[PDB]
Write a protein that binds this ligand. Sequence first.
Ligand code: HEC
Ligand code: HEC
Ligand SMILES: [Cl-]
Ligand SMILES: [Cl-]
Ligand SMILES: [Mg+2]
Length: 419
Amino acid sequence: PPTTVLLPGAPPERVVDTIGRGTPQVASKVDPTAAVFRPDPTLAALGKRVFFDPALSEPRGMSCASCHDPGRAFAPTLSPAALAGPRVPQGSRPGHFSRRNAPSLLYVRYVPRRHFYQDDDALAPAPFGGLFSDGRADTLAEQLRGPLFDPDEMNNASAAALMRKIGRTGLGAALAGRFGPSVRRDPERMVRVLGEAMQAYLQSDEMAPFSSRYDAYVTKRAPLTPQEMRGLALFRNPDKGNCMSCHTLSDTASRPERSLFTDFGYDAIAVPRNRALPANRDPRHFDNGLCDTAAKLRWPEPTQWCAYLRTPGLRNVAIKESFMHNGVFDTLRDAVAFMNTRSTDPARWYHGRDTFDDVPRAYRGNVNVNSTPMNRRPGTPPAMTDADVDDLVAFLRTLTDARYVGLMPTAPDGKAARP
Ligand code: HEC
Ligand code: HEC
Ligand SMILES: [Cl-]
Ligand SMILES: [Cl-]
Ligand SMILES: [Mg+2]
């Protein structure tokens, strides 16, 4: 096709090729700020009701909010068992856990549909977009099927069973009131309209507040501290932090939405294995990220994408209880320190081993060793000092939306609060 629309309301994008089974390659970068969100207010309110309804799990008692706490920027507040164990959300039953850490859902409306784009300084197109860290859902409506029917999360047996359960409650009556009686008879329609309602909620302005001190710096040049400005400088310095090369920002713009702190692209940084995750009880099992989606979509040579994961946005990062797709780090400073010394000090991060412990041998070539600061060899000085790392942490704390600032720690290596 000549064009494709990758975010709601956005200008159509020129398609220059199709990769595998329907993934468009576009001619220009998607600008997430060009999207236009106009969710129907009562539809959004219905989606919010769904989001907080604990009847939607098996056994009952777990809602979306059980892993996406509104008091923590819709990132998980871990159960005591999860905090002591794998550091990813607990599912609907004791001893069952998500396969990955759950992100904040604030700003999720800006995640575009899957597409490829080849920058001027690139030999091949790169993948962007898709929901989940492996991009396996193209839209928010499609995403909903994941947690609802995952035995380790909300654990509904089938769409039919979920439909029967909902149909018997006030939620079923409300859905039938808006959509008509067939939502109580057709399980496919039930799932689809739940997705439409959830999409409206998650696309509402409530779910993209832009209320951080960084945002006040962008809109009004309200001053940050000298330390925070040192961290901002390191963050956009290609020779020190180089963070801006993947966690996109525009600190000279005046619109906060030009700073989402991700380009929604993918890379392979090889964070350490979290052996507390149930799936990793098999030492031959690895969560390989994007290549599972690439295989499903018949992208050519799909294992080139093994160990690739979607670059997360960093807004509200400093109130999370664990970090990276596998929750392996429990402090923000450790995540930043890892970026700086994975390549120079692998034994620190991989239990004395000199190379990655969560990437199969076959896929080690996929790991990024070219981007600063991951491009320095063992025994050479890292790009940044421990003081630089502290300053980066100080800067990342400016990305917390106003209502959540009290959850942040004060010590550079501190953990988010559990009030
Ligand atoms: C804990 C058991 C979960 C429950 C209950 C819900 N979600 Fe969640 N969510 C969870 C994890 C571990 C992740 C990441 C999984 C991965 O493979 O990356 C997610 C992700 C999402 C997303 C995508 C966010 C993104 O890619 O940026 C969305 C939009 C989302 N979750 C929505 C959502 C809904 C609406 C829920 C109730 C129906 C729901 N989640 C429950 C963990 C858990
Ligand atoms: C592109 C090559 C990257 C650069 C340069 C930096 N980061 Fe990044 N980051 C990248 C990816 C692919 C991921 C996900 C990895 C995973 O296993 O999940 C990350 C993750 C983060 C995190 C975790 C955020 C969370 O929500 O869990 C943090 C805190 C982070 N990165 C910080 C960070 C800093 C400060 C950087 C400059 C020193 C930086 N990253 C560079 C990809 C890329
Ligand atoms: Cl447990
Ligand atoms: Cl602007
Ligand atoms: Mg490579």
